[PDB]
Design an enzyme around this catalytic site. Sequence first.
Site, PDB file in Angstrom:
ATOM      1  N   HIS A 199       3.867   5.102   4.657  1.00 11.24           N
ATOM      2  CA  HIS A 199       5.245   4.955   4.202  1.00 11.24           C
ATOM      3  C   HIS A 199       6.035   4.004   5.099  1.00 11.24           C
ATOM      4  O   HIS A 199       6.716   3.095   4.611  1.00 11.24           O
ATOM      5  CB  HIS A 199       5.901   6.332   4.153  1.00 11.24           C
ATOM      6  CG  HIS A 199       7.300   6.326   3.634  1.00 11.24           C
ATOM      7  ND1 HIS A 199       7.595   6.454   2.296  1.00 11.24           N
ATOM      8  CD2 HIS A 199       8.488   6.231   4.275  1.00 11.24           C
ATOM      9  CE1 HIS A 199       8.904   6.429   2.133  1.00 11.24           C
ATOM     10  NE2 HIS A 199       9.469   6.294   3.319  1.00 11.24           N
ATOM     11  N   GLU A 200       5.924   4.172   6.420  1.00 12.11           N
ATOM     12  CA  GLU A 200       6.653   3.290   7.329  1.00 12.11           C
ATOM     13  C   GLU A 200       6.070   1.881   7.351  1.00 12.11           C
ATOM     14  O   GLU A 200       6.803   0.910   7.575  1.00 12.11           O
ATOM     15  CB  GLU A 200       6.666   3.878   8.736  1.00 12.11           C
ATOM     16  CG  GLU A 200       7.352   5.221   8.842  1.00 12.11           C
ATOM     17  CD  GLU A 200       8.834   5.153   8.550  1.00 12.11           C
ATOM     18  OE1 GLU A 200       9.469   4.144   8.911  1.00 12.11           O
ATOM     19  OE2 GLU A 200       9.371   6.112   7.959  1.00 12.11           O
ATOM     20  N   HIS A 212       7.513   0.255   4.503  1.00 13.09           N
ATOM     21  CA  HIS A 212       8.888  -0.084   4.862  1.00 13.09           C
ATOM     22  C   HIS A 212       8.952  -1.371   5.671  1.00 13.09           C
ATOM     23  O   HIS A 212       9.862  -2.182   5.486  1.00 13.09           O
ATOM     24  CB  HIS A 212       9.530   1.058   5.641  1.00 13.09           C
ATOM     25  CG  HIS A 212      10.328   1.989   4.791  1.00 13.09           C
ATOM     26  ND1 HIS A 212      11.097   1.551   3.738  1.00 13.09           N
ATOM     27  CD2 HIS A 212      10.472   3.333   4.829  1.00 13.09           C
ATOM     28  CE1 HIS A 212      11.685   2.584   3.166  1.00 13.09           C
ATOM     29  NE2 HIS A 212      11.322   3.678   3.809  1.00 13.09           N
ATOM     30  N   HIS A 229      12.748   2.378  -0.541  1.00 10.30           N
ATOM     31  CA  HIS A 229      12.419   3.637  -1.183  1.00 10.30           C
ATOM     32  C   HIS A 229      12.589   3.501  -2.689  1.00 10.30           C
ATOM     33  O   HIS A 229      13.340   2.656  -3.178  1.00 10.30           O
ATOM     34  CB  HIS A 229      13.305   4.770  -0.666  1.00 10.30           C
ATOM     35  CG  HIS A 229      13.138   5.064   0.791  1.00 10.30           C
ATOM     36  ND1 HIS A 229      12.034   5.713   1.300  1.00 10.30           N
ATOM     37  CD2 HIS A 229      13.945   4.813   1.847  1.00 10.30           C
ATOM     38  CE1 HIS A 229      12.163   5.839   2.609  1.00 10.30           C
ATOM     39  NE2 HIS A 229      13.314   5.301   2.966  1.00 10.30           N
TER      40      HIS A 229
HETATM   41 ZN   LIG Z   1      11.524   5.917   4.263  1.00  9.02          ZN
END
Ligand SMILES: [Zn+2]
EC number: 3.4.24.79
Lengths: 136, 1115, 388
Positions: free
Chosen positions: B470-471, B474, B480
């Site tokens: 997830h990061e 990012h 998101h």
């Molecule tokens: Zn996030």
Amino acid sequence: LTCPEEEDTVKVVGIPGCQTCRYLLVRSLQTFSQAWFTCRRCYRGNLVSIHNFNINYRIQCSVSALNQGQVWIGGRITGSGRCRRFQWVDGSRWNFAYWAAHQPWSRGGHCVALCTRGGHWRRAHCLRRLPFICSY
Amino acid sequence: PSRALYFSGRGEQLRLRADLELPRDAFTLQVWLRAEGGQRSPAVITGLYDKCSYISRDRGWVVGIHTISDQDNKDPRYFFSLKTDRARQVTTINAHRSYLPGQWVYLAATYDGQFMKLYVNGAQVATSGEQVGGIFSPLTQKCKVLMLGGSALNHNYRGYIEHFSLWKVARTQREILSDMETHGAHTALPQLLLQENWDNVKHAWSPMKDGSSPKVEFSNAHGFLLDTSLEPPLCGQTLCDNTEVIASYNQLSSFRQPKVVRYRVVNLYEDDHKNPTVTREQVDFQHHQLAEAFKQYNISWELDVLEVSNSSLRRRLILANCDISKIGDENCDPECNHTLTGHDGGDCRHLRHPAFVKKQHNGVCDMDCNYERFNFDGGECCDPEITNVTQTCFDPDSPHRAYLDVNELKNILKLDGSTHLNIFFAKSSEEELAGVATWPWDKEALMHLGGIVLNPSFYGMPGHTHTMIHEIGHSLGLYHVFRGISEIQSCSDPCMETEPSFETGDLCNDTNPAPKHKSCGDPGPGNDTCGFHSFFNTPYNNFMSYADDDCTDSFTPNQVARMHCYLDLVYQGWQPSRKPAPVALAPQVLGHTTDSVTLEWFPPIDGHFFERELGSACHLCLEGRILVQYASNASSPMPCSPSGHWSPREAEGHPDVEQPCKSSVRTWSPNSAVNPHTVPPACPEPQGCYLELEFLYPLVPESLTIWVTFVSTDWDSSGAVNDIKLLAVSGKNISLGPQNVFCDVPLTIRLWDVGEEVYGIQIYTLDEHLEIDAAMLTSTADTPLCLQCKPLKYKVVRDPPLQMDVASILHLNRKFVDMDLNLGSVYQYWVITISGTEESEPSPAVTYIHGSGYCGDGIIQKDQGEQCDDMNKINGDGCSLFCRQEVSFNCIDEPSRCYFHDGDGVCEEFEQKTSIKDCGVYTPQGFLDQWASNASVSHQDQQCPGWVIIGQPAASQVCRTKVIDLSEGISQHAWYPCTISYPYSQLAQTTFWLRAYFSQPMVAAAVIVHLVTDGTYYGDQKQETISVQLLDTKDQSHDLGLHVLSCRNNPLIIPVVHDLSQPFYHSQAVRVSFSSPLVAISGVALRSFDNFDPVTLSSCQRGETYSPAEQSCVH
Amino acid sequence: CPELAVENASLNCSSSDRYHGAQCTVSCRTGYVLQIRRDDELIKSQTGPSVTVTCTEGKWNKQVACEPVDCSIPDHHQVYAASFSCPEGTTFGSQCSFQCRHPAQLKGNNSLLTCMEDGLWSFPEALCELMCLAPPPVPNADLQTARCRENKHKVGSFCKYKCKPGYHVPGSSRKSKKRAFKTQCTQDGSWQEGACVPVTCDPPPPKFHGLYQCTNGFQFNSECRIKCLGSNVIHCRKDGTWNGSFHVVPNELNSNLKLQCPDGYAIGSECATSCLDHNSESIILPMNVTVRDIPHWLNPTRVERVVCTAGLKWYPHPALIHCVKGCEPFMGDNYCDAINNRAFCNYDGGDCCTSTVKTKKVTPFPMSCDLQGDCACRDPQAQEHSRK
Ligand SMILES: [Zn+2]
Ligand SMILES: *[C@@H]1O[C@H](CO)[C@@H](O[C@@H]2O[C@H](CO)[C@@H](O)[C@H](O)[C@H]2NC(C)=O)[C@H](O)[C@H]1NC(C)=O
Ligand SMILES: *[C@@H]1O[C@H](CO)[C@@H](O)[C@H](O)[C@H]1NC(C)=O
Ligand SMILES: *[C@@H]1O[C@H](CO)[C@@H](O)[C@H](O)[C@H]1NC(C)=O
Ligand SMILES: *[C@@H]1O[C@H](CO)[C@@H](O)[C@H](O)[C@H]1NC(C)=O
Ligand SMILES: *[C@@H]1O[C@H](CO)[C@@H](O)[C@H](O)[C@H]1NC(C)=O
Ligand SMILES: *[C@@H]1O[C@H](CO)[C@@H](O)[C@H](O)[C@H]1NC(C)=O
Ligand SMILES: *[C@@H]1O[C@H](CO)[C@@H](O)[C@H](O)[C@H]1NC(C)=O
Ligand SMILES: *[C@@H]1O[C@H](CO)[C@@H](O)[C@H](O)[C@H]1NC(C)=O
Ligand SMILES: *[C@@H]1O[C@H](CO)[C@@H](O)[C@H](O)[C@H]1NC(C)=O
Ligand SMILES: *[C@@H]1O[C@H](CO)[C@@H](O)[C@H](O)[C@H]1NC(C)=O
Ligand SMILES: *[C@@H]1O[C@H](CO)[C@@H](O)[C@H](O)[C@H]1NC(C)=O
Ligand SMILES: [Ca+2]
Ligand SMILES: [Ca+2]
Ligand SMILES: [Ca+2]
Ligand SMILES: [Ca+2]
Ligand SMILES: [Ca+2]
Ligand SMILES: [Ca+2]
Ligand SMILES: [Ca+2]
């Protein structure tokens, strides 16, 4: 002296941050030293030292109903030099500053007042008669 | 060659020679001008003024640059103002946008006698018909003067003028475009009153006697045919967020070739290298999980593990999302809730009393008095001799304390973030997520302050393995999934995606809008969302949502396209494979002869025009050999401490403010770094507070831009920036004068005759609230630091293959002409970028049919998706280079000439539904709108009148949102509660209502409520609803529901759901009820059926049939 | 359907037969303005001339009127220095005449204006030219430029008048004794104004005040003779000095005045004057200036000491001394106040004027004060009061 009647004093409590901080707003017009003595005698505490935006916003929501534009919070300018130091009257450290436009460097008085419209602070003269908020 | 005039702001201005005869009836002014960044507020490019005497001033036209809001000085636009000798007013028309402060603009201003028009770059952006008749009589012809580059009151202009021309007849728009193309002479026309290629300035122009004369340089104004600057959308940040670049990355699969990206794990050890931050087992398990999840999406990760032996850093807690200033304050922050923190300095403990009692220090440290309200036991617990520093000192003022922040750890370690993705480890008490990963468009993304912050106790845990993915997403440009629902400021934000789109929300078409939830399914009701109750096909299994780690398993293909495009754009240094970046756009066709064609293509997606060398400055060199660089080392004096010289890490990189005219933390203030307890002094009076910005490579400069972000609102002095002193390597300082600056646009300075090298600048200010965001220095055309650099080559491939002489050639420039075409064949072109010998991926192919048309021929062809077709390939006009007309423009003729229509005065059939400013509120054919009369409100006041709802509303008023004070200018158009403010309504809860009556009691099909304010407070971040009700003639009330306000529903429509079994009821009054006192109602409309009135027709008895034609019972 | 006749308009109907369902388009002529109204409904006029009317239920839904386009009643700024006689009116096609003032000269053939089709008066074919004549004389001053002596001049230039040495514009500083000024021919045919008044030299010392009888008071080249070795005859000089100086219980007190004598009631002694009220100051009041009604542009002379005269009297007589309401100490604290907005208290230190307050925003101590009245800016040095 004479303690202020409770018809001119409101209670502000229920901050969205802390749950133990309670404040008492006296709408009686007094100078800075008289407000300090009044809070220290009749309610056993100094004036309000504001440390976060939740306390300042709840204080602004409480004092927005007043006719007067300025209330007292317990901040002083205790210094002599190229850079003086702000000090709260209760002795807590000054970590949060919420000033207005061009406020700290534009001379003025040696006391700190809170504008009722907007919540931003302002350097004001200590002989002004203003409402005052005490912590207790 | 072409020749140009440079005007500085020092008063250099010309006037026309008196032997020429000025136009009286009609005129046309056409001027090629290159404006500079910061301008004087009423800047005048060319004007006509009366020099008889002081009688009836501002008569005569003036063209220039001026701000729309005079009391604010925010938005500077080109303007044209005219006042004839007979009119009683001066009419000013403005362009549709702020002026571009570095581009050549072809300004044209025509006036025939009934219509004054302003064309910017050949597109009509303003028109007015409030000036009628000739300008001046021949009797007063003797004392009119044409001023260039200034005024009589010295309203001077900074920048270049290239091709001045003045005509005595009003040219049509096609003639404006023809004169834009033809930069030569129009000498065959008798109505050509004046044209000026500046071979002889002194022949036809004379300067002022006390003033100087403008400088004369060369222009190269018409220097490019293909506009290579593509802009990101309103919700985007870089070139990758553009629709065409991300479309070519989504479609062609040669851009998604497998890549290897290096990432570095930074685990701290003690001095003897024993206790780690993460073990080797979880490092290996996280690498296996990461290589598993990214193998399908063609991204491979190469693991580097870096051990740092430091017992001082290892024993200190690292706080991910905890600001140090949030320790002592009385509110309980959930982020700073740790044992080594001190339970947020004791401000989260339950037994805390607000009585600050400072005890006298006596001996040893005590844990019950080591909180904030007991002054941390008088500094005893921070003494190294009394106790250990790394477990007792919770005081943020002390230098050696128990905790530390991740940015302090990044400054201490100071790693090489330009070649690896650095992984840092910090704790998180709220445990919702990890620390903030730096976006690719941040300035720290290739610095030591960038990377990914994670929780080391959940790293490599079998139920927490998807937080790193997830990061990592990012850090590769993915937002998101719930950005367009929950990560918005208000309900009126332009990035709230109502539908899947490439420009709203998280810029992914395959992610349907969704809120944030921890579940693994579609959500239920819509209590927080503005206009949506339920969501379907929600990406709960996406990596970018807040679902559990047993739920998130996939990336949508648009997210993979964004990740590959951001790896190609900004992360070229993280990859060991040296394959160059491709040309992301297809080659464009510019022109064709009878037997040849011409192609021009964009620069590659990296943005670099030169080959890559590690030990050089070739990554700054531009298309010529101009080294464009930003600051590297800022230095300002600390005001309280003399000879302090703190270094602002802001105002170093590229400018990175979102709101251009707002106070931000990304800039430098003169007293930003002072503590709150020390009084911030005023700046020194003779010079001012100064910032010293040093550049990394000293060179001979030619341009210098400064992104001044915030100026004081009521400044009342003349200039903000006091003076700018260039620092030279020889020790000389070159002092430029005081500079006028603007809030929105940057301040651009052209430097003349700076022979010596310049290594830095000093910006002096008399303003205590000035904010400086960046500084950019641009060198001369042949920098000695770009002479060693070797340019990229381009190789053109054709799908019917070229001959062996043509096909093997390599192009230095981005232009390709070929003349081996047949008269009907279909060809396809693409271009591969060759850096050294290694080639890149091919560009998307352009299909050219030699008989048919393309997107640069001037013929609109509806089959190929052409809304318009000019012949320019320039994005400045109303038609883009992809044959798409731009927002709020309309193109009419077959060679498409486009005009600005949203801010027009006339109403056309294609803008009745949308242009509320020009046309009325769009009522359909079967309905009629009756507005209110004699509206009675809840809170009457002198300042808020309460009769402003009567009649038609002010549709030209811009809807305002997130506004703190409503008392500026909206009380002349709408009613809001003047007596109650938002804090007082927050204190005491109440209800505000507005009752509106109508003359004709109709049956309400729908109620149209017009608003000019969203109702949202500036700091509350809470949406607000209204409760419209209908009041009948028998005083009954019918509830029409709770409706969420927006500025995107500015004519808010509340339909009436009426069951047909119930009788139709006449409605007399409407009661609009709301709770927030910041809602302003310009008007309430009752919408009824235009053809018939069903209440009267149902009353008709037996034998009296209905008649909608006369609306009565007929018998 | 009935026949609809519209004045000053051309009417067309696409059908010859008239019935309920037929529409007719009415277009008004140039030089006429439409007025589309209804029954208790005043709507704005259509920009275009094409308006189509349809008969409903045997009646007409609206009325079509087209007034002549009205030019404004002839402005002073339309033609300067002239008077307008328009007996025909201000309608379309009307004509008006203009005639200049007596100093102005009418140059040209035709002196007529016409309210035209576009809604404005036409160009004046003749001009009223204003010529500034000779200026009125200024006493104790001399003209410099020789072209200013002539009766012909342009409008807006300067002519210099120089005062005598000693005579100057009032308000001239002691160090910079500028003795000349200029007057400009204004737009009304007059000149600027300025007179050299005598402000040079000084009043006599307060120890011999009262018995002086000067020719012009304390002014330049005025001889003061105190009526009774040298005598009381002194002459002021050019540079601003004289040739010499003069030689040889107050029970009527105020309501707060106290006189403390460190030297007693001897001859020539100076005693301190104070007001026993804490917020009061001792001033010398003029006889026409009362206590409560001191004007805000008036600065009274503050009293410091009582000094004896040559007639054994106190020059600041305490009967003439008034203890008035002194300045509150909230001066210069970025606070506009109603009490100190006067010349007696330095205009509250400039806190009431936006260019002079250090916060650059006026704040009243009671938020319910008159911002244009009692708490208003009154400083002539500010840019609000200044014409520039
Ligand atoms: Zn996030
Ligand atoms: C990852 O890269 C491979 C190439 O190595 C892509 O495989 C190609 O896929 C297209 C269809 O999408 C086929 O037409 C090609 O023949 C494939 N080439 C090879 C060499 O297999 C694959 O599509 C890429 N995957 C992603 C998600 O981008
Ligand atoms: C360890 O960290 C400290 C900061 O606490 C730093 O000053 C020092 O350079 C680092 N390295 C060593 C070997 O001490
Ligand atoms: C966390 O916060 C709670 C209150 O929110 C507090 O009682 C507790 O002491 C804090 N610390 C830990 C370690 O739970
Ligand atoms: C830390 O504290 C413990 C007990 O308070 C002590 O035994 C130990 O020596 C301390 N460590 C250091 C490095 O001082
Ligand atoms: C975007 O998504 C929609 C479905 O929401 C789909 O119909 C469409 O083809 C996609 N692509 C584009 C370019 O609109
Ligand atoms: C209401 O919306 C919030 C979003 O902040 C969500 O967390 C909550 O679950 C919603 N309530 C229901 C009942 O769905
Ligand atoms: C930045 O400048 C300051 C003072 O000029 C100097 O002390 C510091 O070392 C410089 N830093 C860099 C990275 O050049
Ligand atoms: C340049 O700056 C230095 C200090 O940095 C100063 O001593 C010198 O006088 C300046 N010279 C000029 C020409 O401004
Ligand atoms: C492109 O331009 C010209 C061709 O006219 C030639 O110098 C060469 O092909 C290229 N020049 C550069 C500087 O790349
Ligand atoms: C509105 O209604 C009230 C109540 O009869 C009346 O007094 C007032 O004059 C009305 N105002 C208008 C503008 O009709
Ligand atoms: C038609 O013109 C005349 C000319 O004076 C005017 O009086 C009349 O009012 C005009 N007609 C209408 C309907 O206004
Ligand atoms: Ca806290
Ligand atoms: Ca202790
Ligand atoms: Ca989306
Ligand atoms: Ca910055
Ligand atoms: Ca075409
Ligand atoms: Ca174009
Ligand atoms: Ca329009």
